[PDB]
Coordinates of N, CA and C and ligand atoms in Angstrom, one line a residue:
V1 N 122.0 85.9 94.3 CA 122.5 85.4 95.4 C 121.7 86.1 96.4
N2 N 121.0 85.5 97.8 CA 120.8 86.0 98.8 C 121.0 85.4 100.0
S3 N 120.5 85.7 101.3 CA 120.9 85.4 102.4 C 120.0 84.2 103.1
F4 N 118.8 83.8 102.3 CA 118.2 82.9 102.9 C 118.8 81.2 102.7
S5 N 118.5 80.5 103.7 CA 119.1 79.5 103.9 C 118.0 78.3 104.5
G6 N 118.6 77.3 103.7 CA 118.2 76.1 104.3 C 116.5 75.8 103.8
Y7 N 116.1 76.5 102.5 CA 114.9 76.2 102.2 C 114.6 75.1 100.9
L8 N 113.5 74.6 100.9 CA 113.4 73.5 99.7 C 113.0 74.5 98.4
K9 N 113.1 74.2 97.6 CA 112.8 75.0 96.3 C 111.7 74.0 95.5
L10 N 110.7 74.8 95.8 CA 109.3 74.2 94.9 C 109.4 74.5 93.3
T11 N 109.6 75.8 93.0 CA 109.1 76.2 91.8 C 110.7 77.0 91.1
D12 N 110.5 77.5 90.2 CA 111.5 78.7 89.8 C 111.6 79.8 91.1
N13 N 110.5 80.3 91.4 CA 110.4 81.3 92.3 C 110.1 81.0 93.5
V14 N 109.7 79.4 93.9 CA 108.9 79.8 95.6 C 109.7 78.6 96.0
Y15 N 110.2 79.1 97.4 CA 111.0 78.3 98.5 C 110.1 78.1 99.8
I16 N 110.3 77.0 100.2 CA 109.4 76.9 101.5 C 110.5 76.4 102.9
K17 N 110.2 76.5 104.0 CA 110.9 76.3 105.0 C 110.1 75.9 106.4
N18 N 110.5 75.1 107.0 CA 109.8 75.1 108.4 C 110.5 75.9 109.3
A19 N 109.9 76.8 109.6 CA 110.7 77.9 110.2 C 109.4 79.1 111.0
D20 N 110.1 79.7 111.8 CA 109.0 80.6 112.6 C 109.4 82.0 111.9
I21 N 108.5 82.5 111.4 CA 108.6 83.8 110.6 C 109.4 84.9 111.1
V22 N 109.1 85.2 112.7 CA 109.7 86.0 113.4 C 111.1 85.8 113.8
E23 N 111.2 84.3 113.8 CA 112.9 84.3 114.0 C 113.7 84.6 112.7
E24 N 112.7 84.0 111.4 CA 113.5 84.0 110.3 C 113.6 85.4 109.8
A25 N 112.8 86.4 110.4 CA 113.1 87.7 109.7 C 113.8 88.0 110.6
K26 N 114.0 88.0 112.0 CA 115.2 88.3 113.0 C 116.5 88.4 112.5
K27 N 116.6 86.9 111.7 CA 118.4 86.6 111.3 C 118.4 87.2 109.8
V28 N 117.5 87.1 108.9 CA 117.9 87.8 107.4 C 117.8 89.2 107.6
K29 N 116.8 89.7 108.2 CA 116.4 91.1 107.9 C 116.0 91.2 106.8
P30 N 115.0 90.3 105.9 CA 114.6 90.8 104.7 C 114.0 92.1 104.4
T31 N 114.1 92.5 102.9 CA 113.7 93.7 102.6 C 112.1 93.8 102.9
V32 N 111.5 92.7 102.7 CA 110.0 92.2 102.6 C 109.7 91.5 103.5
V33 N 109.1 91.5 104.7 CA 108.4 90.2 105.7 C 106.9 90.6 105.5
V34 N 106.2 89.6 105.1 CA 104.7 89.7 104.6 C 103.9 89.6 106.1
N35 N 103.3 90.1 106.4 CA 102.1 90.1 107.7 C 100.6 89.3 107.2
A36 N 100.2 88.3 107.7 CA 99.0 87.7 107.7 C 97.6 88.8 108.2
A37 N 97.3 89.8 107.7 CA 97.2 91.1 107.9 C 95.4 90.6 108.0
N38 N 94.5 91.6 109.0 CA 93.1 91.9 108.6 C 92.7 93.4 108.3
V39 N 91.6 93.4 107.9 CA 91.5 94.9 107.4 C 91.4 95.7 108.1
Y40 N 91.6 95.8 109.5 CA 91.8 96.7 110.7 C 93.1 97.0 111.1
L41 N 94.0 96.0 110.4 CA 95.5 95.9 111.0 C 95.1 96.0 112.5
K42 N 94.6 94.9 113.2 CA 94.4 94.5 114.6 C 95.1 93.3 114.6
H43 N 96.6 93.2 115.1 CA 97.3 92.1 115.2 C 97.3 91.4 116.4
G44 N 96.4 90.8 116.8 CA 96.0 90.3 117.9 C 96.4 89.0 118.0
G45 N 96.8 88.2 117.1 CA 97.2 86.6 117.0 C 97.5 86.1 115.8
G46 N 98.0 85.1 115.7 CA 98.5 84.0 114.6 C 99.9 84.4 114.0
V47 N 99.7 84.9 113.1 CA 101.4 85.5 112.3 C 101.5 86.8 112.8
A48 N 100.4 87.5 112.7 CA 100.4 88.8 112.9 C 100.5 89.5 114.4
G49 N 100.0 88.7 115.3 CA 100.2 88.9 116.7 C 101.8 88.7 117.1
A50 N 102.3 87.4 116.7 CA 103.7 87.1 116.7 C 104.5 88.5 116.3
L51 N 104.2 88.8 115.1 CA 105.1 89.7 114.3 C 105.2 91.2 115.2
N52 N 104.0 91.3 115.8 CA 103.6 92.7 116.6 C 104.4 92.8 117.7
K53 N 104.3 91.7 118.5 CA 104.8 91.2 119.6 C 106.4 91.3 119.7
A54 N 107.0 90.7 118.6 CA 108.4 90.9 118.3 C 108.9 92.4 118.3
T55 N 108.0 93.4 117.7 CA 108.4 94.7 117.7 C 108.0 95.4 119.0
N56 N 107.6 95.0 119.6 CA 107.0 95.3 121.0 C 106.0 96.7 121.1
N57 N 105.1 95.9 120.3 CA 103.8 96.6 119.8 C 104.0 97.9 118.9
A58 N 105.2 98.2 118.3 CA 105.5 99.3 117.4 C 104.6 99.1 116.0
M59 N 104.6 97.9 115.9 CA 104.0 97.3 114.5 C 102.3 98.0 115.0
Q60 N 101.5 97.9 115.9 CA 100.4 98.2 116.2 C 99.9 99.3 116.2
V61 N 101.2 100.3 117.0 CA 101.0 101.9 117.0 C 100.9 102.4 115.7
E62 N 102.1 101.7 114.8 CA 101.9 102.4 113.5 C 100.9 102.0 112.6
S63 N 100.2 100.8 113.1 CA 99.2 100.4 112.2 C 98.1 101.4 112.5
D64 N 97.5 101.6 113.7 CA 96.4 102.5 114.3 C 96.5 104.0 113.6
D65 N 97.6 104.2 113.5 CA 97.4 105.6 112.9 C 97.5 105.8 111.2
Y66 N 97.9 104.4 110.5 CA 97.5 104.4 109.3 C 95.9 104.1 109.0
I67 N 95.0 103.2 109.9 CA 93.8 103.1 109.8 C 93.3 104.5 110.0
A68 N 93.6 105.1 111.0 CA 92.8 106.4 111.4 C 93.1 107.5 110.2
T69 N 94.0 107.4 109.7 CA 94.2 108.3 108.3 C 93.5 107.7 107.0
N70 N 93.6 106.4 106.9 CA 93.3 105.6 105.2 C 92.2 105.2 105.6
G71 N 91.6 104.5 106.7 CA 90.8 103.6 106.8 C 90.8 102.2 106.6
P72 N 90.0 101.2 106.8 CA 90.3 99.9 106.8 C 90.7 99.2 105.3
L73 N 91.6 98.6 105.2 CA 92.3 97.9 103.9 C 90.7 97.0 103.1
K74 N 90.8 96.7 102.3 CA 90.0 95.5 101.0 C 90.6 94.4 101.5
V75 N 89.5 93.2 101.7 CA 90.0 91.8 101.8 C 90.7 91.6 100.4
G76 N 91.8 91.3 100.2 CA 92.6 90.9 99.2 C 93.5 91.9 98.9
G77 N 93.7 93.0 99.6 CA 94.2 93.9 99.4 C 95.5 94.3 100.3
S78 N 96.4 95.2 100.3 CA 97.6 95.1 101.1 C 98.1 96.9 101.2
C79 N 99.1 96.7 102.5 CA 99.5 98.1 102.3 C 101.0 97.8 102.8
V80 N 102.1 98.9 102.5 CA 103.5 98.9 103.0 C 103.4 99.8 103.9
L81 N 104.3 99.0 105.1 CA 104.3 99.8 106.4 C 105.8 99.8 106.7
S82 N 106.3 100.2 108.0 CA 107.8 99.7 108.2 C 107.9 98.0 108.5
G83 N 109.1 97.7 108.6 CA 109.4 96.4 109.0 C 110.4 96.4 110.6
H84 N 110.2 97.6 110.7 CA 110.7 98.0 112.4 C 112.1 96.9 112.8
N85 N 112.0 96.1 113.5 CA 113.4 95.6 113.8 C 113.6 94.0 113.2
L86 N 112.5 93.9 112.3 CA 112.1 92.5 111.5 C 112.6 92.4 110.4
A87 N 112.6 93.7 109.7 CA 112.7 93.7 108.1 C 113.1 95.3 107.8
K88 N 113.1 95.5 106.5 CA 113.2 97.2 105.9 C 111.6 97.4 106.1
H89 N 110.6 96.6 105.4 CA 109.3 96.9 105.1 C 108.5 95.6 105.3
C90 N 107.4 96.0 106.1 CA 106.2 95.0 106.3 C 105.4 95.2 105.1
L91 N 105.0 94.4 104.4 CA 103.8 94.0 103.6 C 103.0 93.6 104.1
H92 N 101.8 94.5 104.5 CA 100.5 94.0 105.5 C 99.4 93.2 104.6
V93 N 99.3 92.2 104.1 CA 98.1 91.4 103.2 C 97.0 90.7 103.8
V94 N 96.0 91.1 103.2 CA 94.7 90.5 103.9 C 94.0 89.4 103.1
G95 N 94.8 88.6 103.1 CA 93.7 87.0 102.7 C 92.2 86.9 103.3
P96 N 91.4 86.4 102.5 CA 90.0 86.1 103.2 C 90.1 85.2 104.2
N97 N 89.2 85.6 105.2 CA 89.0 84.8 106.5 C 88.1 83.7 106.7
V98 N 88.0 82.7 106.4 CA 86.8 81.8 106.1 C 86.1 81.6 107.5
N99 N 86.8 82.1 108.3 CA 85.7 81.9 109.8 C 84.9 83.2 109.9
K100 N 85.2 84.3 109.1 CA 84.3 85.2 108.6 C 83.4 85.0 107.6
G101 N 83.6 84.2 106.6 CA 82.5 84.0 105.6 C 83.2 84.5 104.2
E102 N 84.4 85.0 104.2 CA 84.9 85.9 103.1 C 85.0 84.7 101.7
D103 N 85.0 85.3 100.6 CA 85.2 84.6 99.3 C 86.9 84.1 99.2
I104 N 86.9 82.8 99.2 CA 88.7 82.3 99.0 C 88.8 82.5 97.7
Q105 N 88.0 83.2 96.7 CA 88.6 83.4 95.1 C 89.3 84.5 95.8
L106 N 89.1 85.3 96.3 CA 89.8 86.4 96.9 C 91.4 86.3 97.2
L107 N 91.8 85.1 97.8 CA 93.4 84.6 98.3 C 94.1 84.9 97.0
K108 N 93.4 84.7 95.7 CA 94.3 84.9 94.4 C 94.9 86.6 94.5
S109 N 93.7 87.3 94.8 CA 94.0 88.8 94.5 C 95.0 89.0 95.6
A110 N 94.8 88.4 97.0 CA 95.7 88.9 98.1 C 97.3 88.6 97.8
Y111 N 97.5 87.0 97.1 CA 98.7 87.0 96.7 C 99.2 87.8 95.6
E112 N 98.5 88.5 94.6 CA 99.1 89.1 93.4 C 99.8 90.2 94.2
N113 N 99.3 90.9 95.3 CA 100.4 91.7 96.1 C 101.6 91.5 96.0
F114 N 102.0 90.1 96.2 CA 103.7 89.8 96.3 C 104.0 90.1 95.1
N115 N 103.5 90.3 93.8 CA 104.2 90.5 92.8 C 104.9 92.1 92.7
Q116 N 104.5 92.9 93.4 CA 105.3 94.2 93.4 C 106.2 94.5 94.2
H117 N 107.0 93.3 94.7 CA 108.2 92.8 95.5 C 109.1 91.8 95.2
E118 N 110.2 92.2 94.8 CA 111.1 91.1 94.0 C 111.5 90.1 94.9
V119 N 111.6 90.2 96.2 CA 111.9 89.3 97.1 C 110.9 89.2 98.4
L120 N 110.4 88.2 99.1 CA 109.7 88.4 100.3 C 109.9 87.3 100.9
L121 N 109.9 87.5 102.0 CA 109.8 86.2 103.3 C 108.2 86.4 103.6
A122 N 107.3 85.2 103.5 CA 106.0 85.3 104.0 C 105.6 84.0 104.5
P123 N 104.3 84.0 105.0 CA 103.6 83.2 105.5 C 102.8 82.7 104.4
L124 N 102.2 81.5 104.5 CA 100.7 81.0 103.5 C 99.7 82.0 103.8
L125 N 99.1 82.7 102.9 CA 98.1 83.6 103.4 C 96.7 82.7 103.3
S126 N 96.0 83.4 104.2 CA 94.6 82.5 104.7 C 94.8 81.0 105.5
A127 N 96.2 80.8 105.9 CA 96.3 79.6 106.5 C 95.8 79.8 108.0
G128 N 96.7 78.8 109.1 CA 96.5 79.0 110.3 C 95.0 79.7 110.5
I129 N 94.8 80.5 111.8 CA 93.5 81.1 112.3 C 92.5 81.9 110.9
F130 N 93.2 81.6 109.8 CA 92.4 82.4 108.9 C 91.3 81.2 108.2
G131 N 91.7 80.1 108.3 CA 90.9 78.8 108.1 C 90.9 78.1 106.9
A132 N 91.8 79.0 106.0 CA 91.9 78.1 104.7 C 92.5 76.9 104.8
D133 N 92.5 75.9 104.0 CA 93.1 75.1 103.6 C 95.1 75.4 103.2
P134 N 96.0 74.9 104.0 CA 97.1 75.7 103.8 C 97.6 74.7 102.5
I135 N 97.5 73.7 102.0 CA 97.5 72.9 100.5 C 97.2 73.9 99.2
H136 N 95.9 74.1 99.5 CA 95.1 75.0 98.5 C 96.2 76.5 98.6
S137 N 96.2 77.1 99.8 CA 96.9 78.3 99.9 C 98.5 78.0 98.8
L138 N 99.0 77.1 99.3 CA 100.2 76.9 98.5 C 100.4 76.7 96.9
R139 N 99.1 76.3 96.3 CA 98.5 75.8 95.2 C 98.2 77.3 94.3
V140 N 97.6 78.4 95.3 CA 97.3 79.8 94.7 C 98.9 80.3 94.6
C141 N 99.4 80.0 95.8 CA 100.8 81.0 95.7 C 101.7 80.5 94.6
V142 N 101.7 79.3 94.2 CA 102.8 78.8 93.1 C 102.1 79.6 91.9
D143 N 100.5 79.4 91.7 CA 100.1 79.8 90.5 C 99.8 81.2 90.3
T144 N 100.2 82.0 91.5 CA 99.8 83.6 91.5 C 101.3 84.3 91.2
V145 N 102.4 83.9 92.2 CA 103.4 84.9 92.5 C 104.7 84.4 91.7
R146 N 105.1 85.4 90.7 CA 106.3 85.4 89.9 C 107.3 85.8 90.7
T147 N 107.4 86.7 91.5 CA 108.6 87.5 92.1 C 109.1 86.1 93.3
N148 N 110.1 86.4 93.7 CA 110.8 85.3 94.5 C 110.6 85.1 96.2
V149 N 109.6 84.1 96.4 CA 109.3 84.2 97.7 C 109.5 83.0 98.4
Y150 N 109.8 83.5 99.7 CA 110.3 82.6 100.7 C 109.3 82.5 101.6
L151 N 108.5 81.1 101.8 CA 107.7 81.0 102.6 C 108.1 80.1 103.9
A152 N 107.4 80.6 105.1 CA 107.8 79.9 106.1 C 106.8 79.3 106.8
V153 N 106.8 78.2 107.4 CA 105.8 77.5 108.0 C 106.1 76.9 109.4
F154 N 105.1 77.7 110.3 CA 105.6 77.4 111.6 C 105.4 76.0 111.9
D155 N 104.7 75.3 111.5 CA 104.2 74.0 112.3 C 104.9 72.4 111.7
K156 N 105.7 71.9 111.9 CA 106.6 71.1 111.1 C 105.5 69.9 110.6
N157 N 105.0 69.6 111.4 CA 103.8 68.4 110.7 C 103.1 69.0 109.2
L158 N 103.0 70.2 109.3 CA 102.4 70.7 108.4 C 103.1 71.1 107.3
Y159 N 104.3 71.5 107.4 CA 105.4 71.5 106.8 C 105.6 70.4 105.6
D160 N 105.6 69.4 106.1 CA 106.3 67.9 105.9 C 105.3 67.4 105.0
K161 N 103.7 67.9 105.2 CA 102.4 67.6 104.5 C 102.7 68.3 103.3
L162 N 102.6 69.9 103.4 CA 102.9 70.8 102.3 C 103.8 70.2 101.1
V163 N 105.0 69.5 101.6 CA 106.0 69.0 100.8 C 105.3 67.9 100.0
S164 N 105.1 67.0 100.8 CA 104.8 65.7 100.0 C 103.7 65.4 99.5
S165 N 103.0 66.3 99.4 CA 101.5 66.3 98.5 C 101.6 67.7 97.4
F166 N 103.1 68.1 97.4 CA 103.1 69.0 96.0 C 103.2 68.6 95.1
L167 N 102.4 69.3 94.2 CA 102.5 68.7 92.6 C 103.2 69.4 91.7
Ligands
WXO201 O1 105.2 83.0 116.5 C1 104.6 82.6 115.3 N1 105.5 82.1 114.1 C2 104.9 81.6 113.1 O2 105.8 81.3 112.1 C3 103.4 81.4 113.0 C4 102.7 80.7 111.6 C5 101.2 80.4 111.5 S1 100.4 80.2 110.4 O3 98.9 80.6 110.5 O4 101.1 80.8 108.9 N2 100.4 78.3 110.7 C6 100.6 77.6 109.2 C7 99.6 76.9 109.1 C8 99.0 75.9 110.1 C9 100.1 75.6 111.0 C10 100.1 76.6 112.3 C11 101.3 77.9 112.1 C12 100.5 81.1 112.9 N3 101.0 81.6 114.2 C13 102.6 82.0 114.1 N4 103.2 82.0 115.4

């Protein structure tokens, strides 16, 4: 039993809710919140901009130190940093950005990072400003992630479409 409330169960291990991931994180304080990161951990907009704003820019300060030490992430890769006031940990995961021409096949590799964590609160990778089809992203999630994933979808119209078209 865990503290996530109001989710629709899609599969044995995947759950979905129309929610603001920032507000969901603030209330649940999950062990892991997933950020929709880029390779530079520049959290300017989308999910990343919103998560970072909710930390009063502490996420960006920590991220800049990480990059200065380690260099950029790989597309499809991840790193674990602090969750600040939102979660114990933040798993920064880089899905491919279609608006930069990155290979959508890397979306499966991105979701594989979730399997290193027993339970996660997450957005749909490569959705939103990353330019992928969120229905495809949900399919890859379901077919790749084996751990327990609680997906927060900000847009109510999109959430209803994801549910109604789910196979
Ligand atoms: O404050 C915020 N809370 C959020 O949950 C959030 C989620 C996303 S999104 O890319 O995952 N997306 C989901 C796909 C398309 C619908 C529109 C949103 C972007 N910005 C956000 N800002």
